[PDB]
Design a protein around this ligand. Structure first.
Ligand SMILES: COc1cc(C(=O)N[C@H](CO)c2ccccc2)ccc1-c1cn[nH]c1
Ligand SMILES: COc1cc(C(=O)N[C@H](CO)c2ccccc2)ccc1-c1cn[nH]c1
Ligand SMILES: [Cl-]
Lengths: 378, 377
């Protein structure tokens, strides 16, 4: 009997459950947002429901986390459906990185499901290789993701400010290897491994960000300059090995100073990637070891014989990673090659310097419906 | 903290945003969107796809009509019926009141159940029928109450000639039950013996609160035989005290004080109450009983109970050697029900025995006025 009430009480407590209390409050909020228009309020059912919940929903909005609770310090990133702002929480004075996503642009450009795995990865990974999400909240215009601020900037910035030695390339590669294996363990494929999505923490250690491209792998494990050839030839099924192709490209860019399939045109890069058997060649002036060259070549092969298919053990014991500084079991607790020297809690010097509204409707449209359940409070 | 303030609102059972009300909101949204005409909208089709599984799971876990077994229909009314039911799992017997959502919407009366549910769930008075569970489906609102096997006072009057010692007891119980409702800032507006039930021991409890209204700052607000003249022509608490006088008259005399063959004749007799009220020469009634009926059947301005329940309490009619106002409900009742089983419905007459909602093209929101009805004790 009350075993059913116990089963139900458990679902509502579970933070991964779609019917948790934050997700149930999202349902109420979204229903009020999509009905409070004078055209719709002509309906007696709608006008009377909105009159009943008007007071409580005003009270709830004032209590719940909102963008007004934070001060915007600077825009440190921009992307497809939004921007990432360096913000300071007004009450606690704590500094975070907050990612905003336009609800309007996600509906219009019919791309409105990518944020679910991005939010889940950052909120629940519990890995030092993934940027941690503290709070996810939404208003009538945007989705917000308050994550830990990474003051070391991305690996693109590092490469443009330093001539990268093989000892540093061996460190950042190992960290990318472990970070990807952590994502693959959570049953996901990044699909966009690149140095713009590799951030450095206050101590110079890597963390992955921008999970908008992730996909949960099915039972078989299946789903521009850094894209794999098998992904380019698309619609077909690809696996974890496409993420390791991106690692090969990254290690080449680090040591050589240019991407292996760089071309002046977009089509030229595609052409070079497709012809990877004949287009991949190391410059005669490039400072690279035989082990480093041999590792890049094991990643830049056809998917069938690529390194990393039979797990990450084959990658771990590659001769390139032989060193006298770290082990795979402690690399993140060893001293990083470059440690950030920051002047304040809002020093954003490792980041380069960087609105269409919904139309009032006549009939029920339900623009808030695809966002019910986004709110999360740690 | 703000999160502590918010967590308190959701725990409060009187709060419109409690967990049962928040689950009602989700259920009602799914019910009002799952139509193939509406599902043509991408937002709607995708939302329904996401919550389809979990809402099927939630419905199976939550209390439903299929958890109860219908024993007999013991009452029928305006928008539904009251069924004697037995909970399949616990084997406990209850009285379950059903209200058609369709009829409530159609006959544009869809707010009366909020005070009926609140009165029965939260009164905490032995004079009010207790509600244990309120729940709903796509067709009805359900109210699981304590079953009253003694039947109503109409049934008692039709099976017994009422002596003044019995009339003094039942009146005193109506007086205390009405004072309890008035204490909660409510006016019944429909005091009559059909709405007075007797428990397993013969003690009164009030039922059918569909006519109740919360009184404003001054104590004011906005059935043919028991209606007051002021309602026939803002009304206060003394409006319920009129119905008590009519009740005491029907008990002692055997007929209504303003009974007429026509509805217009009854409406005329009530308006001319100053000259139409007279006690039959063959009626066995004391001077005190006659004088009490007359203090209730006056113009609202000078009616007994206008200046409090203390005035009614001290009336000479209630002088007796059996009970006191502080213990009447723990004294022996005049008629104690003789029941054969937990489902003996012999003190209730037999009840003699299809409109569904139309499938819509656009969002109508027929479930919206019912969000927050679910209550679990
Ligand atoms: C720039 O910093 C970030 C960027 C991102 C991120 O996902 N960026 C992309 C494009 O760069 C994007 C996509 C969609 C909308 C906007 C932005 C995620 C975390 C941080 C971060 C974490 N801690 N500190 C900074
Ligand atoms: C018959 O017993 C009841 C009746 C009612 C009641 O409110 N009845 C009216 C008129 O019939 C009605 C209104 C709307 C729909 C249907 C019926 C309320 C409680 C009981 C009851 C019995 N035991 N415990 C509680
Ligand atoms: Cl090693």
């Amino acid at each position: 009997g009350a075993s059913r009430q116990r089963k139900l009480e458990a679902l509502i407590r579970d933070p991964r459950s779609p019917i948790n209390v934050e997700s149930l409050l999202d349902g109420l909020n979204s229903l009020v947002l999509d009905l409070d228009f004078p055209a719709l309020r002509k309906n007696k059912n709608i006008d009377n429901f909105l009159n009943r919940y008007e007071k409580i929903v005003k009270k709830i909005r004032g209590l719940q986390m909102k963008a007004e609770d934070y001060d915007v310090v600077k825009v440190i990133g921009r992307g497809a459906f939004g921007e990432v702002q360096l913000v300071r929480h007004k009450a606690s004075q704590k500094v975070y990185a907050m990612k905003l996503l336009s609800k309007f642009e996600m509906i219009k450009r019919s791309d409105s499901a990518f944020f679910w795995e991005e939010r889940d990865i950052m909120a629940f990974a519990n890995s030092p290789w993934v940027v941690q999400l503290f709070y996810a909240f939404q208003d009538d215009r945007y989705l917000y993701m308050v994550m830990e601020y990474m003051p070391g900037g991305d690996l693109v910035n590092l490469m443009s400010n330093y001539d990268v030695p093989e000892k540093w390339a061996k460190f950042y590669t190992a960290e990318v290897v472990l970070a990807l294996d952590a994502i693959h363990s959570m049953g996901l494929i990044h699909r966009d491994v690149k140095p713009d999505n590799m951030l450095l923490d206050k101590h110079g250690h890597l963390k992955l960000a921008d999970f908008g491209t992730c996909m949960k792998m099915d039972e078989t494990g299946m789903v521009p300059d850094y894209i794999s050839p098998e992904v380019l030839k698309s619609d077909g099924f690809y696996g974890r090995e496409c993420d390791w192709w991106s690692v090969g490209v990254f290690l080449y860019e680090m040591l050589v100073g240019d991407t292996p399939f760089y071309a002046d045109s977009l089509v030229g890069t595609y052409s070079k990637i497709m012809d990877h058997k004949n287009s991949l060649c190391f410059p005669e002036d490039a400072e690279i070891s035989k082990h480093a060259k041999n590792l890049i070549c094991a990643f830049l092969t056809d998917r069938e014989v690529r390194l990393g298919r039979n797990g990450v053990e084959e990658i771990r014991q590659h001769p390139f990673f032989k060193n006298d500084q770290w082990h795979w079991d402690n690399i993140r607790e060893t001293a990083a090659p470059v440690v950030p020297e920051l002047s304040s809690d809002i020093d954003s010097s490792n980041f380069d310097d960087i609105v269409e509204t919904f139309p009032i409707p006549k009939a029920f449209v339900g623009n808030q419906l695809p966002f019910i359940g986004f709110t999360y409070y740690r």
